[PDB]
């Protein structure tokens, strides 16, 4: 069976500034089958209050989801998205970089 | 401008116990307005856009009824496809369905769609004329014979050309303050020195609606794709979209490079320079 | 507005 690995983008809803309330996103796309595990991390630890959009898919049938949580960026704090899927041997970790 | 109404349905079997997971989502352009999740408490078609909340109890009872009928049809479908493909009851399988209509700038029927995939691969699709079927294999051909004998395309064509267009038009009116508004990208450029010979210019497009956008880089007024990175358009989470295009450049030559931005909310394309 | 009829594969 066709097993497509997820594409991952970690980013903020608004351009980030230290001390200003924002939203941390993790966009997972191009994956198949639909079961996927996505966590947002604050200094390597799982953030508890994470919501996600309802499962949808693109023209090519591949699935996409947006995972998100409210956060206040700071200089020291490191944010990341941790993804696990049938196609991944180990969880994939993508760091949040304010410049992308 | 032009508009679309789309419904996306995913059904995933769960062999160990119980009925499949069923998620249905409705869109007008890039805006989700309704949802159904078999795992959620309500067991109702729910609003996801404030302009659909204007619809009264008749609407919600009708949509709930149809979405549960859609769910039971997909449940039977997963069982039918397992038989067509001679698969065991042990594995999890996915049926996906998408249907809807496109309307031109006149808000009149332009195109209709009604297609399926089984396990991520094309199964059966209604052709552009809305009169014939594209059946991928001999399992999909069994569906095609059944539907041809039962005149299924005629029934789908009537909804897609008539009903679909009429309700999209109503949704467009009720949601006119957002649905008929185009949000032009808020653009800016960033610079990042990688070494003393190389720099990265990043051209950002933010808070735009609809999602459709083109970002291109030019070097001395000529299109440049080499040494460029373009991320997939991504949702901001507030109903708008984001995208960036970066170019790797020789340090000190930044001025030769211009970013070109095309979007529905922009009457003429815009240019950005470092 | 969902399709009122459904057709089985």
XYZ file of N, CA and C in Angstrom, chain A residues 30-80:
153
model
N 0.749 16.135 2.979
C 1.210 15.101 2.047
C 1.345 13.679 2.577
N 0.707 13.368 3.718
C 0.832 12.060 4.361
C -0.323 11.111 4.074
N -0.021 9.807 4.169
C -0.957 8.711 3.966
C -0.384 7.426 4.588
N -1.135 6.631 5.379
C -2.536 6.812 5.803
C -2.717 8.008 6.773
N -3.965 8.290 7.172
C -4.349 9.471 7.958
C -3.912 9.482 9.439
N -3.715 8.325 10.101
C -3.258 8.323 11.494
C -1.875 8.941 11.615
N -1.726 9.895 12.527
C -0.486 10.651 12.730
C -0.471 11.142 14.197
N 0.733 11.291 14.753
C 0.896 11.820 16.099
C 1.693 13.093 15.930
N 1.183 14.190 16.439
C 1.835 15.499 16.366
C 1.769 16.138 17.755
N 2.934 16.560 18.264
C 3.087 17.284 19.525
C 3.878 18.548 19.258
N 3.598 19.600 20.026
C 4.375 20.834 20.054
C 5.192 20.755 21.355
N 6.481 21.117 21.295
C 7.401 21.046 22.428
C 7.924 22.422 22.863
N 8.007 22.631 24.188
C 8.578 23.818 24.827
C 9.772 23.297 25.630
N 10.989 23.608 25.170
C 12.257 23.166 25.769
C 12.291 21.617 25.895
N 11.864 20.957 24.816
C 11.825 19.502 24.690
C 10.656 18.785 25.346
N 9.803 19.514 26.122
C 8.674 18.909 26.840
C 7.364 19.112 26.095
N 6.498 18.101 26.105
C 5.218 18.152 25.431
C 4.284 19.223 26.010
N 3.791 20.132 25.146
C 2.809 21.169 25.532
C 1.436 20.475 25.608
N 0.745 20.632 26.740
C -0.536 19.966 27.001
C -1.752 20.493 26.236
N -1.949 21.803 26.141
C -3.154 22.313 25.475
C -2.924 22.627 23.981
N -2.915 21.561 23.165
C -2.719 21.655 21.713
C -4.025 21.243 20.977
N -4.482 22.093 20.059
C -5.674 21.828 19.261
C -5.235 21.555 17.832
N -6.130 20.989 17.036
C -5.868 20.724 15.630
C -7.111 20.930 14.799
N -6.896 21.303 13.529
C -7.974 21.436 12.549
C -8.546 20.015 12.226
N -9.721 19.972 11.608
C -10.362 18.724 11.203
C -9.685 18.169 9.965
N -9.520 16.833 9.930
C -8.873 16.142 8.827
C -9.467 16.488 7.472
N -8.597 16.945 6.608
C -8.935 17.269 5.238
C -7.805 16.797 4.343
N -7.987 16.906 3.026
C -7.019 16.435 2.085
C -7.047 17.287 0.830
N -5.953 17.181 0.062
C -5.703 17.929 -1.169
C -6.182 17.137 -2.385
N -6.108 17.763 -3.581
C -6.482 17.215 -4.895
C -5.922 15.809 -5.114
N -4.625 15.579 -4.725
C -3.908 14.299 -4.827
C -4.244 13.267 -3.718
N -5.310 13.530 -2.899
C -5.797 12.686 -1.797
C -4.931 12.702 -0.529
N -3.784 13.386 -0.548
C -2.928 13.388 0.639
C -3.471 14.341 1.706
N -3.406 13.851 2.943
C -3.941 14.486 4.124
C -3.164 15.663 4.618
N -3.852 16.606 5.272
C -3.200 17.721 5.955
C -3.933 18.076 7.245
N -3.159 18.531 8.234
C -3.606 18.954 9.547
C -2.769 20.105 10.036
N -3.412 21.006 10.742
C -2.734 22.096 11.409
C -2.914 21.853 12.896
N -1.798 21.851 13.648
C -1.765 21.716 15.092
C -1.312 23.051 15.606
N -1.912 23.517 16.676
C -1.625 24.864 17.170
C -1.867 25.036 18.658
N -1.165 26.021 19.258
C -1.290 26.418 20.668
C -0.857 27.872 20.855
N -1.424 28.559 21.842
C -1.059 29.928 22.151
C 0.270 29.885 22.900
N 1.177 30.794 22.540
C 2.478 30.876 23.169
C 3.025 32.315 23.180
N 3.872 32.602 24.155
C 4.553 33.878 24.253
C 6.030 33.602 24.019
N 6.512 33.910 22.796
C 7.927 33.688 22.500
C 8.841 34.517 23.417
N 10.003 33.962 23.761
C 11.045 34.628 24.556
C 12.369 34.306 23.889
N 13.468 34.941 24.342
C 14.816 34.702 23.806
C 15.289 33.270 24.050
N 15.182 32.788 25.299
C 15.702 31.485 25.738
C 14.893 30.252 25.307
N 13.552 30.323 25.393
C 12.641 29.228 25.108
C 12.719 28.725 23.662
N 12.865 27.398 23.530
C 12.965 26.710 22.259
C 11.706 25.915 21.977
N 11.114 26.149 20.807
C 9.886 25.476 20.415
C 10.169 24.516 19.274
N 9.349 23.461 19.165
C 9.542 22.394 18.184
C 8.302 21.608 17.984
